[PDB]
Design a protein around this ligand. Structure first.
Ligand code: CA
Lengths: 411, 413, 417, 417
């Protein structure tokens, strides 16, 4: 049964998903190949988005001497799917990670949440991220390697829009226009202040505060809306507010001005709206947190003068298509340590998809409904329900995965 | 035989429930579509059908003008306005035939089913359409207008959810023109446009101001949409003020909607000047399908004199949300029926049937019983089998009517 | 039933792989052809189809003029230009229908005569509406006086299997100073070669004349649709001093028009008592051929600036040329030809052409990145069945040209039996 | 089991006759290929294989330089030069393995990416280590990041059967004054033809300059491994007196180096108001091609010795050329191509290549005196079995490039089932 073969052995090629999502489509296999370099602590982390419906496979981070991670690069597919296709569905995927340059070990786990929801990302802490014995693997020798196999997080998923470019012309050569993954958005609601009282002595240059900081996840476009209302009895106060989207490594990935020299009028509701749209091309690395900064200042102010105001307000962060299964969750982490500095950790995999070509390609790419295979879904359901008894893992010591492949091409 | 298969391939015989896993208590209905369109002076035109549209919008007719541009004629809808009687809907099956019925043999038809939405077509000329798709069973060429063509709607996914119909909601207002509805929303489509990234604008003063069009992009919309985001302007010059307007353009190039985004918005020096977008375009304002969006900015210096240089830098992104836009059938796919060489003044007759699963509005629910629908064990498998053998069976989305008629017979036997 | 037979006899149902021994990884595609041709004032015309052409060239339309000459109208191609997306091709099956679809304001009319000729366009001995009926002796390759309103169906029948894939005349990566520069990789396998001995000690003689004396050394019928080359050499001998030659090659279209002219010699002075060599090296690229070529002629212009009382113009010549039509002998590339002629059709009416071409194709480098290719369904008895059907062609009445009503009946009788 | 299938899937076991319809009396032979290539200082390189080449040319090795350009190392051939003993050939099957076999004194490393492209070398759009992964969409024609120590196996899969025998480029009996004279009978059937319209009334204009003004009229990607010819003609028109042209053709290798330069015009003076003809007749023999050719360019140098105040250099040109790659379109001769790229391999290491090529051959006249030839075992279902296997290629996982460990497992699973 082709689909089962594709599901369990992605490197053999694609097959159509035997569900009820009957769209005329085409099937494709995209490889991923990377030779990553080990930093001086000999330790690092690769974050994989096993169910990502598109070209984003993961991100590599090296562990620094000071204990912080540092972003290296994204891991994508051989070609950029949005450039040739407009819609996509993930069929199957598998990636292997091993050193190619003995030295070191790998710990790996499949977590059912999104990146920022992990409570512990240390080499050893990962082993507890899940309680499923078949979703974690420990101290595998780097030379032997580990294999990440993508297992379903729901079928009958709709096709996802790929963030493809749309026809557009503009004065700015840096103009960008796309149609993004949107169906099934994820929404975070943050009530930053409920009659929060701010008070402080003047200061030339203003007084800065960080109203709040929250963990959120984003890999592609998102928007931030909402409003803060300020009340004050003091005259001459002005506010400056800024939103920061922080990366997994602690760096600032994006900053947006929300208020600039916004003067506060006494005894009135002062409105501070948020109308931000963050496009995919601006997100250089996965975003794991958001924070708001407010700077309070008094132009005609003197030492001694108090600056104060009261605020209430809620924001809504919308990650477009964020709740589409595979888009942000689950996550598979592959951590390595004790690897010789300057070694090469080699990544190699295959992603299989159901796709709908963009207009230009549609002129030459035939699309179809796809082989009818009466018992394929039942067989898949049966296999997955016996997952523990059959030992079907999401993370494998590669040698065992290889044995599993043989034991299968048997039957 | 399986009722659903019968309904799918021969919509004119009536509705049947989709044999998927979307088990909702519903009712089944058939809505006809009948139009007698008039041919313009070039004898050429285009009918754009939304084969999978979950509701009363069937298509739009455009005539080709001597200058080479299309001109909107009218929308093609179902006999009655579904949102007036129902709140939720799902398309079961549909078919329409197009043929000439009058003489004032004359003309031919080219038809194709494109897997994208209207503004995504790269070529909409009578002959260019033949390449919109590579699937031989989704295009048909030079059929005589008198014999006609038949558009058959084929699925673009099952287990689709029910769609809110854009029905009116209970509301009262001081304005007699007030309108309130619950719109198709699940599965929105989102377009993200970065209009400027430190874009430098510079120009010498000029009474009345200077206008530019920052960008123009192709997008699709038939029903309600929203536009949000913000532009941020920086300037070193004093006394400048901006006016900004958003335009939503139709397939025929005409302006369908215009919205002020900025009016006499003064720019302060050495600060981030914020220009937010909070636009909501309701369905009743869209008079024809929207195929593009553009932003206009007018820079002016009130107390300015000849020689004065006006300048500013801008950065910003917008998000256009088409409510329910990505629901399969709502914007894609599209079936185009083009005709040429038809005698001017002739009548091009459209006739069809749309079958739906529906949930009645509160008033109608008092008298309309709803149910889960006939259990039919092998209907889905049979459907899957038929569609997978689509090429071997020759099941088309566009047919020469005579062939579709033969296909019906070969099926009923 | 065998998908291939279905595709062969009913091309509009789509493509299928040829069940022969040419096992190449490929993809299958259907290209449609749609045209609305306008009838000229004599009410008569001719469509020339290349039933087996391995690529986008389907045919050419010509109107018959009051003076009895044909005049080129336009080429008939497929919806898209295959060479833009693919590099190699093989024709699987094809069919086209021709019928009137019109009556202009101010009494329908006309008939069609159609025939499938086993040679190439220029080899036809008679191209008149009635003459066509004798181009072949096969009753199943000709059809007479079919009403234009009913129409005729052209069905492509094989001219050999196990044919190689043909290079498509695709663009190749190139940059040049000239914005009009053109570079392609052309159909070449199986060239067709014409050899013409233009002179074997031919004696030319004449009295001076300002501007020179012109002669057409020869004119010969040849066929070309795409690129060709012409090489060779003429050798001139003379006793007279001061003679200079100009030589030109012309490629003529089916309508008699000059499609191509190429200088082969310009102010070439002849030296006495020596072998004067005139080499030809002409390469005529496909983009320069605007309509099918059906003849070639060579012109020589002799001028005697010099001047010597009593001397006259004279020289002796010998020479042969070779005309190479790239891929010209690939079955289907130039032969066979199916002609569809119409007459008595009301002026201003529309003759509508509609068809499908099915191909095995290998995508170009950019498309290969998103287009999977395969060897194609194994179908054990497909070839034997094909061979059986074709051998019983006469008993079964499988024609290359059909009155459309009959072709339709035939389709029914097939989707049954 | 069918000997042919055995030979096809496991070439190292020896040759077998192709079970097609090309019944020629022949003999069967295996030629080995063995090379120990040295890794340069970037630790990166590329081996280009011609999997289907009907003869001794197996491939070419290139090292990647620090500046990002490739540099030709050497050709990869078979143990003996087939053309020396045979005149005709057909490729039956082939496989080669590439693996590191070394560690130099003072920590192993590296990976291999390999892909089988359906075009010829110059048609590739990206030849970088990672870019290769997208050359084709077929999952069974690409393999990524295989450890160099384990190695990769290239397996030659058919690009059509019923192929003709190919002339081998064998020496022919000849004697000449020049001890460097060379004479061969070359692979010719199925030529590949490129057509380039270099100019169509292109206007050139410029101010005098001692030594002349040089321009590259065009540059185009083409492929050649063995002999080719270039014919054609440029026509120049000018109003200026005293202009003289020099024209040169260059054939460039994959590494950008000039492999061949040929004068096409030397001090060709232009006469005013006349057609000035510049014919090309270049024949580039195989022994002159030192590495695969991937581009061609034409240079024109205009000089105005004359001198006339106000006159400038200028002329108008028209012209087309045809590049004929003898036997170039014979499947396997130029396409397909299998690239094996390596990176991060320790400088100075040895990348070892080992393989076998199996052929149907017709001996030369001297060898024919002691080499019996035959038609070859009749094997009734061998072709059907072959067709069945290839059609189930994806289900069976038959690849053109393999991680060697997997290919070995596949061999076992075959010598069983
Ligand atoms: Ca379902």
């Amino acid at each position: 049964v082709p689909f089962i073969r594709s599901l369990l052995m992605p490197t053999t090629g694609p097959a159509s998903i035997p569900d009820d999502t009957l769209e005329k489509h085409t099937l494709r296999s995209e490889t991923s190949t990377y030779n990553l370099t080990v930093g001086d602590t000999g330790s690092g982390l690769i974050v994989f988005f096993p169910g990502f419906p598109g070209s984003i496979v993961g991100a590599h981070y090296t562990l620094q001497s000071n204990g912080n991670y540092k972003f290296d690069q994204m891991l994508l597919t051989a070609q950029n799917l949005p450039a040739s296709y407009n819609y996509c569905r993930l069929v199957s995927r598998s990636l292997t990670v091993r050193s190619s340059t003995l030295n070191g070990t790998i710990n790996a786990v499949t977590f059912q949440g999104s990146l920022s929801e992990l409570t512990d990302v240390s080499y050893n802490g990962l082993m507890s991220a899940t309680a499923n014995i078949n979703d974690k693997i420990g101290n595998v020798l780097v030379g032997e390697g580990v294999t990440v196999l993508s297992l379903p997080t729901s079928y009958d998923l709709g096709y996802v829009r790929l963030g493809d470019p749309i026809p557009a012309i503009g004065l700015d050569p840096k103009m960008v226009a796309t149609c993004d993954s949107s169906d099934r958005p994820r929404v975070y609601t943050i009530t930053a202040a409920d009659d929060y009282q701010f008070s402080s002595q003047y200061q030339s240059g203003g007084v800065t505060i960080t109203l709040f900081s929250a963990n959120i996840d984003a890999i592609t476009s998102l928007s931030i809306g909402g409003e803060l209302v300020f009340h004050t009895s003091v005259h001459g106060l002005a506010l400056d507010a800024t939103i920061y989207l922080i990366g997994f490594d602690g760096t600032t990935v994006i900053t947006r001005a929300v208020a600039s020299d916004n003067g506060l009028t006494t005894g009135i509701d002062n409105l501070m709206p948020f109308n931000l749209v963050i496009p995919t091309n601006e997100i250089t690395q996965p975003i794991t947190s958001i924070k708001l900064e407010i700077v309070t200042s008094k132009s005609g102010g003197q030492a001694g003068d108090q600056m104060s105001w009261s605020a209430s307000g809620s924001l809504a962060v919308t990650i477009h298509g964020g709740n589409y299964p595979g888009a942000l969750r689950p996550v598979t982490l592959v951590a390595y340590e004790r690897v010789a500095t300057g070694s090469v950790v080699t990544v190699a995999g295959v992603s299989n998809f159901e796709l709908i070509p963009n207009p230009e390609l549609a002129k030459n790419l035939v699309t179809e409904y796809g082989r009818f295979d009466p018992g394929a879904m039942n067989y898949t359901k049966l296999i997955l329900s016996e997952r523990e008894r059959l030992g079907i893992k999401t993370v494998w010591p590669t040698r065992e995965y290889t044995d599993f492949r043989e034991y299968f091409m048997e039957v």
